[PDB]
């Protein structure tokens, strides 16, 4: 009777046809699917709930099941004729109609306006602007560590590692700009959908985690000033491989779920997160929650604790003259890294959380969902913009941070 119960019946019986031996097992599973499809056709989905049945989107919902019943009948005729393997092969087309429903009515397909007025759009233009700016500033930091500075100092190792993680992350921007321009048509294959997808997640986490390491190292330098006096930076050689391995382990679900799947309504081959279709909404909300916790929640708490910790040790001294001037300058540099992390990542994680609620069934309003969809590529751009801000805050401007920290300590 219920829409959730009807789609559970449709998915469970699709697996039965695959495991079926004779025509009787195929006929039984198709009849159960035929009854569930006509029952779901009568029901109203959580999305577009406050809409009349005469509406074109409601007419399209009923028509979606008319294609499904028509496809069931074609396979049922082969099953009634004795053709077992032919009916099972015909039942593979039902999976395409099933995937069309999860993309349109469970996803943002029916809400967001599909027609795209692509004529040198702002997204590919802004993506290439951030690319060349970010690539040029990060190349300077990488080339400086190679033949202009050296491999000395604890903090300096993290500067180079953050610059490499940022450079490789910004290097993926021309791919996404081309991917956007072709109306989400992945022209690299299902193998490169996993490769580029994981490479993006790996370098993104490596960037975020090295920012976290910088905050911990900056905090440790204040509370324990004896650490900088140490001739040997023993922990640095073990922290760097651990962070890269943590970024690799975090990019594992990306390598497992990313795959090129055909979008039935758009008529495009998109590199999407191919979760099990029977529990697609649950997986989409779970991974979106994982994005917020691991990529924003845990690092922001670490970055803030380190900032308030430096503020606690500095403000209790009650300085006068140049000691007060140099103190305030250190506090402005320490606040700049926490502020830049918020401005650049908060819009994305808020929209990711709002999108997670849309999958669960909390946000069903198409007006809200349409805004989330068009704002998302701009929010993604802000995440990449953090990689352009990083060389300035840590290498260029943040070079006098260690000198001013040694000035207040004398
Ligand atoms: C700034 C970094 C970034 N660049 C991106 C570039 C492009 C896109 N888009 C949408 C797009 C395409 C073209 C133009 C504009 C938008 C895509 O379709 C693809 C992404 C990966 C392969 S295709 C998304 C992102 C994007 O969400 N992010 C942030 C981010 C957040 C979370 C995770 C993550 C964490 C843990 C577990 C899994 C994931 C995970 N999310 N998506 N796949 N894997 C990874 C990356
Ligand atoms: C300097 C950077 C210029 C490189 C941009 C090349 C370009 O215009 O790309 C077209 C794109 O594939 C379509 O949106
Ligand atoms: C677009 C990045 C802007 C960064 C803002 C950080 C400045 C904080 C200083 C006050």
Crossing angle for the helix pair 56-80 and 94-104, to the nearest 10 degrees: 160
| Residue 129 burial (CB count, 10 A) | 13
Q: Do 268 and 204 reside in the same domain of the chain? A: yes
3-state secondary structure the chain: CCHHHHHHHHHHHHHHHHHCCCHHHHHHHHHHHHHHHHHHHHCCCCCCCCCCCCCHHHHHHHHHHHHHHHHHHHHHHHHHCCCHHHHHHHHHHHHHHHHHHHHHCCCCCCCCCCCCCCCCCHHHHHHHHHHHHHHHHHHHHHHHHHHHHCCCCHHHHHHHHHHHHHHHHHCCHHHHHHHHHCCCCCCCCHHHHHHHHHHHHHHHHHHHHHHHHHHHHHHHHHHCHHHHHCCCCCCHHHHHHHHHHHHHHHCHHHHHHEEEEEECCCCEEEEEECCCHHHHHHHHHHHHHHHHHHHHHHHHHHHHHHHHHHHHHHHCCCCCCHHHHHHHHHHHHHHHHHHHHHHHHHHHHHHHHHHHHHHHCCCCCHHHHHHHHHHHHHHHHHHHHHHHHHHHHHHHHHHCHHHHHHHHHC
Taking alpha carbons only, the member of 283, 278, 272 closest to residue 101 is 278
Q: Do 148 and 92 reside in the same domain of the chain? A: no
User: Phi and psi of 231, rounded to 5°?
Assistant: -65, -20
Token pair in block for residue 216:
């911990």
- The answer to whether position 18 is within a domain reads yes
β-partners of residue 259 are 272
Q: Do 362 and 396 reside in the same domain of the chain? A: yes
Q: Do 245 and 297 reside in the same domain of the chain? A: yes
Range of the structural domain that residue 228 is part of: 122-409
- The answer to whether position 111 is within a domain reads no
- Answer whether 298's CB lies under 8 Å from 341's CB: no
Buried b (16+ CB within 10 A) or exposed e, 201-235: bbbbbbbbbbbbbbbbbbbbbbeeeeebeeeebee
Q: Do 131 and 204 reside in the same domain of the chain? A: yes
Q: Do 212 and 298 reside in the same domain of the chain? A: yes
- The answer to whether position 117 is within a domain reads no
Q: How many domains does the chain have?
A: 2
Query: How far is ligand 3, taken at its centre, from the CA of residue 397, in Å?
Result: 12
Calculate the CA 28 to chain-centre distance.
41
Residues with CB under 6 A from ligand 1: 176, 179-180, 197, 200-201, 204, 250, 253-254, 258, 271, 273, 287, 290-291, 295, 377, 380, 383-384
Last residue of a domain, one of 105, 139, 154: 105
Query: How far is ligand 1, taken at its centre, from the CA of residue 76, in Å?
Result: 41
Query: What's the CATH number where 246 sits?
Result: 1.20.1070.10
Resolution (A): 2.8
Query: How far is ligand 1, taken at its centre, from the CA of residue 313, in Å?
Result: 39
User: Does residue 340's CB lie within 6 angstroms of at least one atom of ligand 3?
Assistant: yes
Token pair in block for residue 174:
């021309």
- The answer to whether position 115 is within a domain reads no
Conformation bin of residue 268: beta by default, left when phi > 0, alpha when psi is -120 to 50? beta
Experimental determination technique: X-ray
Q: What is the pairing mode between strands 268-273 and 258-263?
A: antiparallel
Burial class (CB in 10 A: 0-12, 13-18, 19+), 120: exposed
Q: Do 64 and 141 reside in the same domain of the chain? A: no
- The answer to whether position 110 is within a domain reads no
Rounded Cα–Cα distance for residues 387 and 384 (Å): 5
Rounded Cα–Cα distance for residues 274 and 255 (Å): 11
| Residue 176 burial (CB count, 10 A) | 19
User: Phi and psi of 45, rounded to 5°?
Assistant: -70, 160
Give me Rg for the CA atoms of the chain: 27
Taking alpha carbons only, the member of 286, 202, 316 closest to residue 248 is 202
Q: Do 321 and 369 reside in the same domain of the chain? A: yes
User: Does residue 181's CB lie within 6 angstroms of at least one atom of ligand 2?
Assistant: yes
Q: Do 319 and 255 reside in the same domain of the chain? A: yes
Q: Do 285 and 361 reside in the same domain of the chain? A: yes
Non-local CB neighbours of 342 within 8 Å, separated by 6+ positions: 300
Per the listing, tokens 């039935």 go with 264
Calculate the CA 244 to chain-centre distance.
19
- The answer to whether position 91 is within a domain reads yes
Query: How far is ligand 2, taken at its centre, from the CA of residue 151, in Å?
Result: 36
User: Does residue 133's CB lie within 6 angstroms of at least one atom of ligand 3?
Assistant: no
β-partners of residue 260 are 271
Q: Do 168 and 255 reside in the same domain of the chain? A: yes
User: Phi and psi of 50, rounded to 5°?
Assistant: -85, 65
Taking alpha carbons only, the member of 407, 301, 83, 271 closest to residue 74 is 83
Taking alpha carbons only, the member of 304, 303, 295 closest to residue 352 is 295
Rounded Cα–Cα distance for residues 111 and 117 (Å): 17
| Residue 240 burial (CB count, 10 A) | 16
Q: Do 248 and 326 reside in the same domain of the chain? A: yes
> Which ligand lies nearest the alpha carbon of 386?
3
β-partners of residue 268 are 263
β-partners of residue 258 are 273
């Amino acid at each position: 009777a219920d829409l959730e119960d009807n789609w559970e019946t449709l998915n469970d019986n699709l697996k039965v046809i695959e495991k079926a031996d004779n025509a009787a097992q195929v006929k039984d599973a198709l009849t159960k699917m035929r009854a569930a499809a006509l029952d779901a056709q009568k029901a109203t989905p959580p999305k577009l709930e406050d809409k009349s049945p005469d509406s074109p989107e409601m007419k399209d919902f009923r028509h979606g099941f008319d294609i499904l019943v028509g496809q069931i009948d074609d396979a049922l005729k082969l099953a009634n004729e004795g053709k077992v393997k032919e009916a099972q092969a015909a039942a593979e087309q039902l999976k395409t109609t099933r995937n069309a429903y999860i993309q349109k009515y469970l996803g943002s397909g029916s809400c967001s306006q599909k027609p795209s007025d692509k004529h040198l759009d702002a997204i590919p233009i802004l993506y290439y602007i951030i690319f060349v700016i970010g690539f040029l500033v990060n190349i300077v930091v990488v080339t400086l560590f190679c033949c202009q500075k050296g491999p000395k100092k604890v903090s300096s190792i993290y500067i180079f590692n953050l610059a490499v993680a940022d450079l490789l992350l910004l290097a993926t921007l021309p791919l996404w700009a081309t991917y956007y321009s072709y109306r989400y048509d992945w022209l690299f294959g299902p193998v490169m959908c996993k490769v580029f997808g994981s490479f993006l997640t790996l370098n993104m986490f490596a960037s975020i985690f090295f920012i976290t390491c910088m905050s911990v190292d900056r905090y440790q330098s204040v509370i324990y000033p004896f650490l900088s006096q140490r001739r040997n930076p023993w922990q640095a050689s073990y922290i760097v491989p651990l962070v890269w391995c943590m970024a690799c382990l975090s990019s594992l679900p990306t390598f497992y779920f990313r795959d090129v799947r055909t979008i039935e309504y758009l008529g495009v081959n998109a590199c999407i997160m191919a979760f099990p279709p029977e529990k697609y909404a649950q997986w989409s909300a779970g991974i979106a929650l994982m994005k917020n916790i691991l990529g924003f929640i845990i690092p922001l708490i670490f970055i803030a604790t380190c900032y308030f910790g430096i503020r606690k040790h500095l403000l209790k001294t009650n300085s006068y003259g140049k000691n007060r001037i140099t103190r305030d300058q250190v506090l402005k540099m320490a606040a700049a890294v926490v502020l830049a992390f918020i401005i650049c990542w908060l819009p994305f994680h808020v929209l990711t959380f709002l999108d997670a609620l849309a999958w669960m069934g909390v946000i069903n309003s198409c007006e809200v969902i349409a805004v989330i969809d068009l704002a998302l590529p701009f929010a993604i751009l802000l995440g990449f913009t953090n990689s352009c801000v990083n060389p300035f805050l840590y290498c260029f401007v943040g070079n006098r941070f260690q000198q001013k920290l040694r000035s207040v300590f004398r």
